[PDB]
């Protein structure tokens, strides 16, 4: 399905763009 996992580059965004 969609977010092929994207929840990771979600966190990583935060984590980035904290």
Same mark, same amino acid.
């Given at each position: #399905?969609?977010? *092929? *996992? @994207?929840? *990771? #580059?979600? @966190?990583? @965004? @935060?984590?980035?763009?904290?």
């Amino acid at each position: #399905k969609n977010l *092929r *996992r @994207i929840t *990771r #580059k979600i @966190i990583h @965004i @935060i984590k980035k763009y904290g």
